[PDB]
Amino acid sequence: MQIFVKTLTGKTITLEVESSDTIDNVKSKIQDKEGIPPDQQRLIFAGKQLEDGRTLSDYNIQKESTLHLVLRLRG
Amino acid sequence: MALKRINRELADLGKDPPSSSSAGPVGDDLFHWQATIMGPADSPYAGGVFFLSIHFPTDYPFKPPKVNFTTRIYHPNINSNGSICLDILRDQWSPALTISKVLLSISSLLTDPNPDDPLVPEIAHVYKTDRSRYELSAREWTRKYAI
Protein backbone atom coordinates (compact mmCIF):
# COMPACT_ATOMS: atom_id res chain seq x y z
CA MET A 1 0.00 0.00 0.00
CA GLN A 2 0.89 3.70 0.10
CA ILE A 3 1.17 5.99 3.13
CA PHE A 4 1.92 9.68 3.63
CA VAL A 5 4.08 11.17 6.39
CA LYS A 6 3.94 14.90 7.15
CA THR A 7 6.88 16.44 8.98
CA LEU A 8 7.04 19.43 11.32
CA THR A 9 8.44 21.37 8.34
CA GLY A 10 5.32 20.67 6.26
CA LYS A 11 7.10 18.19 3.99
CA THR A 12 5.02 15.24 2.78
CA ILE A 13 6.75 11.92 2.06
CA THR A 14 5.03 9.06 0.22
CA LEU A 15 6.09 5.55 1.25
CA GLU A 16 5.22 2.27 -0.48
CA VAL A 17 4.68 -0.02 2.51
CA GLU A 18 2.49 -2.93 3.61
CA SER A 19 0.28 -3.53 6.62
CA SER A 20 2.61 -6.36 7.67
CA ASP A 21 5.70 -4.13 7.40
CA THR A 22 7.40 -3.58 10.74
CA ILE A 23 7.96 -0.16 12.27
CA ASP A 24 11.68 -0.77 11.82
CA ASN A 25 11.21 -1.34 8.08
CA VAL A 26 9.23 1.89 7.65
CA LYS A 27 11.83 3.77 9.70
CA SER A 28 14.53 2.35 7.43
CA LYS A 29 12.55 3.56 4.41
CA ILE A 30 12.27 7.02 5.98
CA GLN A 31 16.02 7.03 6.66
CA ASP A 32 16.72 6.06 3.05
CA LYS A 33 14.44 8.79 1.68
CA GLU A 34 15.45 11.54 4.14
CA GLY A 35 18.55 10.46 6.07
CA ILE A 36 16.83 10.69 9.48
CA PRO A 37 18.10 7.87 11.75
CA PRO A 38 15.37 5.46 12.88
CA ASP A 39 16.14 6.22 16.53
CA GLN A 40 15.44 9.92 15.90
CA GLN A 41 12.16 9.29 14.04
CA ARG A 42 8.98 9.89 16.06
CA LEU A 43 5.94 8.79 14.06
CA ILE A 44 2.42 9.45 15.36
CA PHE A 45 -0.73 7.90 13.88
CA ALA A 46 -4.22 8.37 15.33
CA GLY A 47 -2.62 9.77 18.48
CA LYS A 48 -0.39 6.72 19.04
CA GLN A 49 3.39 6.90 18.67
CA LEU A 50 4.85 4.09 16.58
CA GLU A 51 7.34 1.93 18.48
CA ASP A 52 10.18 -0.23 17.19
CA GLY A 53 9.58 -3.97 17.09
CA ARG A 54 5.91 -3.70 16.08
CA THR A 55 4.08 -3.57 12.75
CA LEU A 56 1.80 -1.09 11.01
CA SER A 57 -1.10 -3.54 11.40
CA ASP A 58 -0.64 -3.25 15.18
CA TYR A 59 -1.55 0.45 14.86
CA ASN A 60 -4.46 -0.10 12.43
CA ILE A 61 -2.57 1.65 9.62
CA GLN A 62 -4.52 1.24 6.38
CA LYS A 63 -4.45 2.40 2.76
CA GLU A 64 -3.31 6.02 2.34
CA SER A 65 -2.70 6.59 6.04
CA THR A 66 -1.35 9.94 7.24
CA LEU A 67 1.38 9.98 9.90
CA HIS A 68 3.05 12.88 11.71
CA LEU A 69 6.82 13.09 12.15
CA VAL A 70 7.91 14.98 15.27
CA LEU A 71 11.24 15.54 17.01
CA ARG A 72 12.52 14.72 20.48
CA LEU A 73 11.22 16.59 23.50
CA ARG A 74 13.55 18.47 25.85
CA GLY A 75 11.81 19.13 29.17
CA MET B 1 -8.40 37.74 18.87
CA ALA B 2 -7.39 37.64 22.55
CA LEU B 3 -10.97 38.08 23.84
CA LYS B 4 -13.31 36.74 21.15
CA ARG B 5 -11.37 33.47 21.20
CA ILE B 6 -11.72 33.23 24.98
CA ASN B 7 -15.45 33.94 24.77
CA ARG B 8 -15.81 31.25 22.09
CA GLU B 9 -13.95 28.72 24.24
CA LEU B 10 -16.12 29.52 27.26
CA ALA B 11 -19.28 29.21 25.16
CA ASP B 12 -18.13 25.86 23.76
CA LEU B 13 -17.45 24.58 27.27
CA GLY B 14 -20.91 25.84 28.23
CA LYS B 15 -22.67 23.76 25.54
CA ASP B 16 -21.28 20.20 25.78
CA PRO B 17 -19.60 19.82 29.18
CA PRO B 18 -17.18 16.87 29.50
CA SER B 19 -19.16 15.89 32.64
CA SER B 20 -15.81 15.29 34.39
CA SER B 21 -13.61 18.36 33.89
CA SER B 22 -15.05 21.86 34.30
CA ALA B 23 -13.60 25.31 33.66
CA GLY B 24 -14.75 28.86 34.27
CA PRO B 25 -13.66 32.44 34.92
CA VAL B 26 -12.96 33.45 38.51
CA GLY B 27 -15.07 36.40 39.60
CA ASP B 28 -15.28 38.91 36.74
CA ASP B 29 -12.18 38.47 34.59
CA LEU B 30 -11.60 36.69 31.28
CA PHE B 31 -7.85 36.07 31.71
CA HIS B 32 -7.86 34.00 34.94
CA TRP B 33 -9.71 30.67 34.90
CA GLN B 34 -10.31 27.93 37.45
CA ALA B 35 -10.52 24.30 36.34
CA THR B 36 -11.62 21.14 38.15
CA ILE B 37 -10.38 17.71 37.05
CA MET B 38 -11.83 14.44 38.31
CA GLY B 39 -9.39 11.66 39.10
CA PRO B 40 -9.49 9.03 36.36
CA ALA B 41 -11.00 5.74 37.50
CA ASP B 42 -8.30 3.63 35.80
CA SER B 43 -5.44 5.42 37.61
CA PRO B 44 -4.34 5.38 41.27
CA TYR B 45 -5.73 8.93 41.65
CA ALA B 46 -9.26 7.53 41.34
CA GLY B 47 -11.97 9.21 43.39
CA GLY B 48 -10.04 12.47 43.74
CA VAL B 49 -10.69 16.05 42.64
CA PHE B 50 -7.91 18.41 41.55
CA PHE B 51 -7.85 22.16 40.99
CA LEU B 52 -5.97 24.02 38.26
CA SER B 53 -5.32 27.73 37.76
CA ILE B 54 -5.11 28.84 34.13
CA HIS B 55 -3.61 32.19 33.10
CA PHE B 56 -4.18 33.23 29.50
CA PRO B 57 -1.30 35.34 28.15
CA THR B 58 -2.28 38.49 26.29
CA ASP B 59 -0.80 36.95 23.12
CA TYR B 60 -3.46 34.22 23.09
CA PRO B 61 -3.91 32.04 21.04
CA PHE B 62 -0.34 32.41 19.73
CA LYS B 63 1.12 31.59 23.15
CA PRO B 64 0.00 28.69 25.35
CA PRO B 65 -1.84 29.31 28.63
CA LYS B 66 0.01 28.78 31.90
CA VAL B 67 -1.63 26.00 33.91
CA ASN B 68 -0.60 25.32 37.51
CA PHE B 69 -1.87 22.71 39.94
CA THR B 70 -3.18 23.70 43.36
CA THR B 71 -3.64 20.42 45.27
CA ARG B 72 -0.55 18.37 46.07
CA ILE B 73 -0.17 15.27 43.89
CA TYR B 74 2.43 12.49 44.08
CA HIS B 75 3.35 12.35 40.40
CA PRO B 76 6.72 11.97 38.62
CA ASN B 77 5.96 14.68 36.04
CA ILE B 78 4.36 17.23 38.40
CA ASN B 79 6.65 19.34 40.56
CA SER B 80 5.86 20.02 44.21
CA ASN B 81 5.11 23.71 43.63
CA GLY B 82 2.47 22.75 41.07
CA SER B 83 4.12 23.19 37.68
CA ILE B 84 3.34 20.79 34.84
CA CYS B 85 5.94 19.68 32.28
CA LEU B 86 3.57 18.98 29.39
CA ASP B 87 4.63 19.25 25.75
CA ILE B 88 1.25 20.47 24.48
CA LEU B 89 1.60 23.57 26.68
CA ARG B 90 5.34 24.17 26.14
CA ASP B 91 6.59 23.40 22.61
CA GLN B 92 3.98 21.56 20.51
CA TRP B 93 1.30 24.25 20.88
CA SER B 94 -0.63 25.49 17.85
CA PRO B 95 -3.50 27.99 17.63
CA ALA B 96 -5.93 25.19 16.74
CA LEU B 97 -5.65 23.81 20.28
CA THR B 98 -8.38 24.88 22.70
CA ILE B 99 -8.54 24.83 26.49
CA SER B 100 -10.60 21.62 26.56
CA LYS B 101 -7.81 19.80 24.72
CA VAL B 102 -5.38 20.83 27.47
CA LEU B 103 -7.72 19.48 30.15
CA LEU B 104 -8.10 16.19 28.26
CA SER B 105 -4.33 15.93 27.87
CA ILE B 106 -3.81 16.51 31.60
CA SER B 107 -6.51 13.99 32.51
CA SER B 108 -4.70 11.50 30.27
CA LEU B 109 -1.35 12.38 31.87
CA LEU B 110 -2.79 11.63 35.32
CA THR B 111 -3.01 7.97 34.20
CA ASP B 112 0.15 7.41 32.10
CA PRO B 113 3.10 9.29 33.64
CA ASN B 114 5.90 9.99 31.17
CA PRO B 115 9.25 8.67 32.52
CA ASP B 116 11.27 10.47 29.82
CA ASP B 117 10.93 13.76 31.76
CA PRO B 118 11.72 12.92 35.40
CA LEU B 119 10.61 16.29 36.76
CA VAL B 120 10.96 14.66 40.19
CA PRO B 121 13.83 12.19 39.68
CA GLU B 122 13.29 10.33 42.96
CA ILE B 123 9.61 9.62 42.30
CA ALA B 124 10.28 8.80 38.64
CA HIS B 125 12.96 6.31 39.69
CA VAL B 126 10.53 4.76 42.19
CA TYR B 127 7.94 4.51 39.41
CA LYS B 128 10.39 2.82 37.04
CA THR B 129 11.67 0.44 39.76
CA ASP B 130 8.76 -0.40 42.11
CA ARG B 131 5.42 0.25 40.41
CA SER B 132 3.40 -1.10 43.35
CA ARG B 133 5.19 1.13 45.86
CA TYR B 134 4.69 4.16 43.60
CA GLU B 135 0.97 3.43 43.25
CA LEU B 136 0.62 2.95 47.01
CA SER B 137 2.38 6.27 47.65
CA ALA B 138 0.19 8.05 45.10
CA ARG B 139 -2.99 6.66 46.66
CA GLU B 140 -1.81 7.63 50.14
CA TRP B 141 -1.07 11.18 48.97
CA THR B 142 -4.45 11.44 47.23
CA ARG B 143 -6.19 10.28 50.41
CA LYS B 144 -4.19 12.74 52.52
CA TYR B 145 -4.64 15.83 50.33
CA ALA B 146 -7.20 15.46 47.52
CA ILE B 147 -9.96 14.15 49.79
Next chain:
Amino acid sequence: SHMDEYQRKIAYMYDRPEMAVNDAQLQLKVSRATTFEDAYDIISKLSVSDMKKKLLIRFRNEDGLDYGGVSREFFYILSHAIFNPGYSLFEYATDDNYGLQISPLSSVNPDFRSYFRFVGRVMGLAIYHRRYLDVQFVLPFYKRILQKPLCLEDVKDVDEVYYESLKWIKNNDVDESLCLNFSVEENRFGESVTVDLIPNGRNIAVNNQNKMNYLKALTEHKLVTSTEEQFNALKGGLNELIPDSVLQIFNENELDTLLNGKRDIDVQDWKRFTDYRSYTETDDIVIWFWELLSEWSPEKKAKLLQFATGTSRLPLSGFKDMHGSDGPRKFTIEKVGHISQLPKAHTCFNRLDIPPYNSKEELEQKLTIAIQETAGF
Protein backbone atom coordinates in the same frame (compact mmCIF):
# COMPACT_ATOMS: atom_id res chain seq x y z
CA SER C 1 37.61 34.49 7.56
CA HIS C 2 35.01 36.38 9.59
CA MET C 3 37.61 38.06 11.80
CA ASP C 4 39.75 39.43 8.96
CA GLU C 5 36.84 41.13 7.20
CA TYR C 6 35.52 42.49 10.50
CA GLN C 7 38.95 43.88 11.40
CA ARG C 8 39.23 45.51 7.97
CA LYS C 9 35.78 47.06 8.42
CA ILE C 10 36.68 48.37 11.88
CA ALA C 11 39.93 49.89 10.62
CA TYR C 12 38.19 51.52 7.66
CA MET C 13 35.43 52.89 9.90
CA TYR C 14 37.81 54.39 12.46
CA ASP C 15 39.98 55.74 9.63
CA ARG C 16 37.21 58.04 8.39
CA PRO C 17 37.74 61.79 9.00
CA GLU C 18 34.19 62.10 10.36
CA MET C 19 35.00 59.94 13.42
CA ALA C 20 38.30 61.50 14.52
CA VAL C 21 38.70 62.52 18.16
CA ASN C 22 40.12 65.90 19.12
CA ASP C 23 43.10 66.63 21.39
CA ALA C 24 41.46 68.32 24.39
CA GLN C 25 40.28 66.27 27.36
CA LEU C 26 36.73 66.38 28.74
CA GLN C 27 36.27 65.57 32.41
CA LEU C 28 33.16 63.73 33.60
CA LYS C 29 32.68 63.12 37.34
CA VAL C 30 29.87 60.79 38.42
CA SER C 31 29.12 59.41 41.87
CA ARG C 32 29.36 55.63 42.02
CA ALA C 33 26.03 55.26 43.84
CA THR C 34 24.06 57.70 41.66
CA THR C 35 25.58 56.80 38.30
CA PHE C 36 22.38 56.95 36.24
CA GLU C 37 21.15 60.31 37.52
CA ASP C 38 24.47 62.13 37.11
CA ALA C 39 25.13 60.46 33.76
CA TYR C 40 21.76 61.63 32.44
CA ASP C 41 22.27 65.11 33.89
CA ILE C 42 25.67 65.61 32.24
CA ILE C 43 25.44 63.66 28.98
CA SER C 44 21.99 64.91 27.97
CA LYS C 45 23.29 68.51 28.07
CA LEU C 46 26.57 68.10 26.17
CA SER C 47 26.99 69.29 22.59
CA VAL C 48 27.95 67.23 19.56
CA SER C 49 31.27 69.05 19.17
CA ASP C 50 32.05 68.60 22.87
CA MET C 51 31.31 64.86 22.86
CA LYS C 52 33.88 64.27 20.10
CA LYS C 53 36.81 65.11 22.39
CA LYS C 54 38.76 62.61 24.47
CA LEU C 55 36.70 61.19 27.34
CA LEU C 56 38.23 61.29 30.83
CA ILE C 57 36.18 59.89 33.71
CA ARG C 58 36.91 60.22 37.43
CA PHE C 59 34.61 58.72 40.04
CA ARG C 60 34.04 61.12 42.92
CA ASN C 61 36.16 60.50 46.02
CA GLU C 62 37.94 57.67 44.14
CA ASP C 63 41.26 58.95 42.78
CA GLY C 64 43.48 56.49 40.95
CA LEU C 65 45.56 55.73 37.88
CA ASP C 66 44.79 53.62 34.77
CA TYR C 67 41.86 55.73 33.62
CA GLY C 68 41.10 53.12 30.96
CA GLY C 69 39.86 50.66 33.56
CA VAL C 70 37.89 53.41 35.27
CA SER C 71 36.19 54.37 32.00
CA ARG C 72 35.41 50.74 31.21
CA GLU C 73 33.89 50.24 34.66
CA PHE C 74 31.84 53.42 34.24
CA PHE C 75 30.49 52.26 30.89
CA TYR C 76 29.70 48.82 32.32
CA ILE C 77 27.78 50.36 35.23
CA LEU C 78 25.91 52.77 32.97
CA SER C 79 24.99 50.02 30.50
CA HIS C 80 23.69 47.78 33.29
CA ALA C 81 21.75 50.75 34.68
CA ILE C 82 19.99 52.28 31.67
CA PHE C 83 19.15 48.94 30.01
CA ASN C 84 17.80 47.46 33.26
CA PRO C 85 14.15 46.36 32.88
CA GLY C 86 13.45 47.57 36.42
CA TYR C 87 13.88 51.13 35.11
CA SER C 88 10.94 50.68 32.70
CA LEU C 89 12.92 51.59 29.57
CA PHE C 90 13.77 48.18 28.07
CA GLU C 91 12.34 44.73 28.71
CA TYR C 92 13.18 41.09 28.09
CA ALA C 93 11.49 39.60 25.05
CA THR C 94 10.52 36.57 27.16
CA ASP C 95 11.12 35.60 30.77
CA ASP C 96 12.75 32.29 29.78
CA ASN C 97 14.75 33.83 26.89
CA TYR C 98 16.36 37.09 27.99
CA GLY C 99 16.46 39.39 24.97
CA LEU C 100 16.34 43.15 25.51
CA GLN C 101 13.93 45.23 23.44
CA ILE C 102 12.19 48.58 23.67
CA SER C 103 9.28 48.30 26.10
CA PRO C 104 5.92 49.39 24.61
CA LEU C 105 4.79 50.45 28.10
CA SER C 106 7.63 53.00 28.24
CA SER C 107 5.32 55.48 26.49
CA VAL C 108 3.46 55.87 29.80
CA ASN C 109 6.14 58.31 30.97
CA PRO C 110 5.38 62.01 30.38
CA ASP C 111 8.40 62.39 28.07
CA PHE C 112 10.25 59.27 26.93
CA ARG C 113 11.99 61.12 24.09
CA SER C 114 14.59 62.71 26.36
CA TYR C 115 15.51 59.40 28.00
CA PHE C 116 15.69 57.53 24.70
CA ARG C 117 17.80 60.28 23.14
CA PHE C 118 20.10 59.90 26.15
CA VAL C 119 20.27 56.14 25.52
CA GLY C 120 21.11 56.78 21.87
CA ARG C 121 23.83 59.24 22.89
CA VAL C 122 25.27 56.67 25.31
CA MET C 123 25.40 54.00 22.60
CA GLY C 124 26.99 56.44 20.17
CA LEU C 125 29.54 57.44 22.79
CA ALA C 126 30.39 53.79 23.47
CA ILE C 127 30.88 53.06 19.77
CA TYR C 128 32.78 56.31 19.18
CA HIS C 129 35.33 55.92 21.99
CA ARG C 130 36.08 52.21 21.46
CA ARG C 131 34.30 51.20 24.68
CA TYR C 132 32.03 48.19 25.06
CA LEU C 133 28.68 47.88 26.77
CA ASP C 134 27.63 44.46 28.08
CA VAL C 135 24.03 44.11 26.90
CA GLN C 136 22.60 41.61 24.40
CA PHE C 137 19.69 42.90 22.31
CA VAL C 138 17.61 40.90 19.84
CA LEU C 139 18.63 40.75 16.19
CA PRO C 140 15.55 42.69 14.98
CA PHE C 141 16.83 45.66 16.99
CA TYR C 142 20.14 45.63 15.11
CA LYS C 143 18.34 45.17 11.80
CA ARG C 144 16.22 48.22 12.64
CA ILE C 145 19.31 50.29 13.45
CA LEU C 146 20.78 49.51 10.02
CA GLN C 147 17.38 50.06 8.34
CA LYS C 148 16.86 46.57 6.95
CA PRO C 149 13.47 45.08 6.05
CA LEU C 150 11.96 42.86 8.75
CA CYS C 151 10.25 39.62 7.73
CA LEU C 152 8.59 36.67 9.46
CA GLU C 153 11.81 34.80 10.25
CA ASP C 154 12.97 37.74 12.39
CA VAL C 155 10.30 36.81 14.95
CA LYS C 156 12.28 33.63 15.65
CA ASP C 157 14.90 35.58 17.61
CA VAL C 158 12.29 37.50 19.62
CA ASP C 159 9.96 34.67 20.66
CA GLU C 160 10.09 31.04 19.54
CA VAL C 161 6.52 30.04 20.39
CA TYR C 162 5.07 33.10 18.66
CA TYR C 163 7.06 32.29 15.52
CA GLU C 164 5.92 28.66 15.62
CA SER C 165 2.29 29.77 15.88
CA LEU C 166 2.71 32.20 12.98
CA LYS C 167 4.35 29.51 10.85
CA TRP C 168 1.53 27.10 11.69
CA ILE C 169 -1.00 29.70 10.55
CA LYS C 170 1.01 30.15 7.35
CA ASN C 171 1.15 26.42 6.58
CA ASN C 172 -2.20 24.96 7.65
CA ASP C 173 -5.48 26.38 6.38
CA VAL C 174 -7.20 28.71 8.84
CA ASP C 175 -10.82 27.80 9.54
CA GLU C 176 -13.72 29.84 10.91
CA SER C 177 -13.46 28.07 14.28
CA LEU C 178 -10.39 30.14 15.19
CA CYS C 179 -11.74 33.52 16.32
CA LEU C 180 -8.84 35.40 14.74
CA ASN C 181 -9.38 38.91 13.40
CA PHE C 182 -7.36 42.01 12.55
CA SER C 183 -7.00 43.28 16.12
CA VAL C 184 -4.41 43.00 18.89
CA GLU C 185 -5.37 43.30 22.57
CA GLU C 186 -2.67 44.91 24.72
CA ASN C 187 -2.90 45.13 28.52
CA ARG C 188 -1.21 48.34 29.70
CA PHE C 189 -1.42 48.86 33.48
CA GLY C 190 -4.52 46.77 34.05
CA GLU C 191 -6.67 48.27 31.31
CA SER C 192 -6.71 46.28 28.06
CA VAL C 193 -7.13 48.17 24.78
CA THR C 194 -7.63 47.08 21.18
CA VAL C 195 -5.40 48.14 18.28
CA ASP C 196 -6.66 47.62 14.72
CA LEU C 197 -4.08 46.47 12.18
CA ILE C 198 -6.35 47.73 9.38
CA PRO C 199 -9.30 50.15 9.50
CA ASN C 200 -12.37 48.45 10.95
CA GLY C 201 -10.05 45.54 11.70
CA ARG C 202 -11.98 44.12 14.66
CA ASN C 203 -14.88 43.03 12.40
CA ILE C 204 -12.95 41.15 9.68
CA ALA C 205 -12.03 37.49 9.98
CA VAL C 206 -8.91 35.90 8.48
CA ASN C 207 -9.90 33.65 5.58
CA ASN C 208 -7.47 31.63 3.46
CA GLN C 209 -7.07 34.61 1.10
CA ASN C 210 -6.11 37.04 3.89
CA LYS C 211 -3.87 35.08 6.26
CA MET C 212 -0.76 36.27 4.42
CA ASN C 213 -1.76 39.90 4.98
CA TYR C 214 -2.59 39.02 8.59
CA LEU C 215 0.87 37.55 9.16
CA LYS C 216 2.55 40.52 7.49
CA ALA C 217 0.59 43.01 9.60
CA LEU C 218 1.24 41.06 12.81
CA THR C 219 4.98 40.86 12.16
CA GLU C 220 5.19 44.56 11.29
CA HIS C 221 3.16 45.57 14.35
CA LYS C 222 5.08 43.34 16.76
CA LEU C 223 8.52 44.34 15.49
CA VAL C 224 8.13 47.94 14.29
CA THR C 225 4.90 49.88 14.65
CA SER C 226 4.55 49.38 18.41
CA THR C 227 7.84 51.27 19.00
CA GLU C 228 7.89 54.04 16.39
CA GLU C 229 8.38 57.20 18.46
CA GLN C 230 10.74 55.68 21.01
CA PHE C 231 13.03 54.01 18.48
CA ASN C 232 12.98 57.11 16.29
CA ALA C 233 14.22 59.17 19.24
CA LEU C 234 16.83 56.53 20.07
CA LYS C 235 18.14 56.41 16.50
CA GLY C 236 18.21 60.20 16.33
CA GLY C 237 20.34 60.23 19.45
CA LEU C 238 22.61 57.54 18.02
CA ASN C 239 23.03 59.20 14.60
CA GLU C 240 23.74 62.52 16.33
CA LEU C 241 27.36 61.32 16.61
CA ILE C 242 27.79 58.37 14.21
CA PRO C 243 26.62 59.28 10.69
CA ASP C 244 24.32 56.65 9.23
CA SER C 245 26.61 56.29 6.20
CA VAL C 246 29.10 54.62 8.57
CA LEU C 247 26.84 52.09 10.30
CA GLN C 248 25.64 50.83 6.90
CA ILE C 249 28.82 48.82 6.22
CA PHE C 250 28.13 46.18 8.90
CA ASN C 251 25.46 43.53 9.36
CA GLU C 252 23.27 42.37 12.25
CA ASN C 253 26.15 40.40 13.84
CA GLU C 254 29.20 42.61 13.29
CA LEU C 255 27.33 45.55 14.83
CA ASP C 256 26.59 43.40 17.88
CA THR C 257 30.28 42.49 18.12
CA LEU C 258 31.24 46.16 17.78
CA LEU C 259 28.83 47.28 20.51
CA ASN C 260 29.42 44.48 23.04
CA GLY C 261 32.83 43.08 22.13
CA LYS C 262 33.52 39.37 21.93
CA ARG C 263 30.77 37.81 24.04
CA ASP C 264 31.96 35.48 26.79
CA ILE C 265 30.41 33.59 29.70
CA ASP C 266 31.95 34.17 33.12
CA VAL C 267 32.78 31.00 35.04
CA GLN C 268 33.28 32.46 38.52
CA ASP C 269 29.70 33.76 38.57
CA TRP C 270 28.47 30.43 37.20
CA LYS C 271 30.20 28.56 40.02
CA ARG C 272 29.15 31.01 42.74
CA PHE C 273 25.46 30.97 41.78
CA THR C 274 24.70 27.27 41.21
CA ASP C 275 23.07 24.63 43.40
CA TYR C 276 23.30 20.85 43.66
CA ARG C 277 20.86 18.02 44.31
CA SER C 278 22.34 14.79 45.70
CA TYR C 279 25.73 16.44 45.06
CA THR C 280 28.09 18.32 47.35
CA GLU C 281 30.54 21.09 46.50
CA THR C 282 33.41 18.83 47.62
CA ASP C 283 32.50 15.96 45.27
CA ASP C 284 35.09 14.97 42.68
CA ILE C 285 32.71 15.22 39.72
CA VAL C 286 31.82 18.80 40.63
CA ILE C 287 35.42 20.00 40.85
CA TRP C 288 36.34 18.18 37.64
CA PHE C 289 33.38 19.80 35.89
CA TRP C 290 34.39 23.24 37.12
CA GLU C 291 38.00 22.75 36.00
CA LEU C 292 36.81 21.65 32.56
CA LEU C 293 34.58 24.71 32.32
CA SER C 294 37.50 26.90 33.38
CA GLU C 295 39.73 25.60 30.57
CA TRP C 296 37.18 25.71 27.74
CA SER C 297 36.57 27.89 24.70
CA PRO C 298 33.70 30.43 24.78
CA GLU C 299 31.82 28.67 21.97
CA LYS C 300 31.77 25.33 23.79
CA LYS C 301 30.73 26.97 27.06
CA ALA C 302 27.87 28.67 25.23
CA LYS C 303 26.90 25.33 23.69
CA LEU C 304 26.81 23.70 27.13
CA LEU C 305 24.78 26.59 28.54
CA GLN C 306 22.22 26.27 25.75
CA PHE C 307 22.15 22.48 26.13
CA ALA C 308 21.47 22.66 29.88
CA THR C 309 19.40 25.79 30.49
CA GLY C 310 17.79 25.99 27.04
CA THR C 311 19.28 29.25 25.73
CA SER C 312 22.68 30.85 25.29
CA ARG C 313 21.53 34.27 26.56
CA LEU C 314 21.95 35.30 30.20
CA PRO C 315 20.02 37.90 32.23
CA LEU C 316 21.45 41.36 32.76
CA SER C 317 22.74 40.46 36.24
CA GLY C 318 24.38 37.11 35.53
CA PHE C 319 23.18 33.76 36.83
CA LYS C 320 21.69 35.24 40.02
CA ASP C 321 18.43 36.45 38.43
CA MET C 322 17.92 33.36 36.27
CA HIS C 323 14.30 32.46 35.50
CA GLY C 324 12.97 29.03 34.62
CA SER C 325 9.73 28.11 32.90
CA ASP C 326 7.74 28.74 36.12
CA GLY C 327 9.81 30.99 38.39
CA PRO C 328 13.33 32.04 39.38
CA ARG C 329 15.42 28.88 39.00
CA LYS C 330 19.20 28.70 39.35
CA PHE C 331 21.52 26.37 37.44
CA THR C 332 21.05 22.99 39.13
CA ILE C 333 23.36 19.97 38.97
CA GLU C 334 21.93 16.59 39.95
CA LYS C 335 23.24 13.03 40.19
CA VAL C 336 20.85 11.03 37.99
CA GLY C 337 21.39 8.03 35.75
CA HIS C 338 23.82 5.19 35.16
CA ILE C 339 27.52 5.48 34.32
CA SER C 340 27.12 4.56 30.65
CA GLN C 341 24.38 7.13 30.01
CA LEU C 342 25.37 10.55 28.72
CA PRO C 343 24.85 13.70 30.82
CA LYS C 344 21.21 14.64 30.30
CA ALA C 345 19.50 18.02 30.52
CA HIS C 346 16.15 19.37 31.71
CA THR C 347 15.77 22.72 29.97
CA CYS C 348 12.52 23.97 31.51
CA PHE C 349 14.02 23.39 34.97
CA ASN C 350 17.57 24.63 34.24
CA ARG C 351 18.87 21.25 35.41
CA LEU C 352 21.83 19.13 34.33
CA ASP C 353 22.05 15.42 35.22
CA ILE C 354 25.66 14.19 35.38
CA PRO C 355 26.01 10.52 36.42
CA PRO C 356 28.90 9.74 38.78
CA TYR C 357 31.73 9.02 36.34
CA ASN C 358 35.13 7.74 37.49
CA SER C 359 37.81 9.73 35.63
CA LYS C 360 37.83 13.37 34.54
CA GLU C 361 38.78 12.40 30.98
CA GLU C 362 35.65 10.26 30.69
CA LEU C 363 33.57 13.14 32.04
CA GLU C 364 35.03 15.52 29.46
CA GLN C 365 34.47 13.08 26.60
CA LYS C 366 30.88 12.31 27.58
CA LEU C 367 30.03 15.97 28.15
CA THR C 368 31.52 17.04 24.81
CA ILE C 369 29.71 14.25 22.96
CA ALA C 370 26.37 14.96 24.63
CA ILE C 371 26.22 18.60 23.43
CA GLN C 372 27.29 18.24 19.79
CA GLU C 373 23.78 18.49 18.33
CA THR C 374 23.33 21.81 20.18
CA ALA C 375 24.47 25.01 18.46
CA GLY C 376 25.65 27.93 20.58
CA PHE C 377 26.24 31.52 19.49
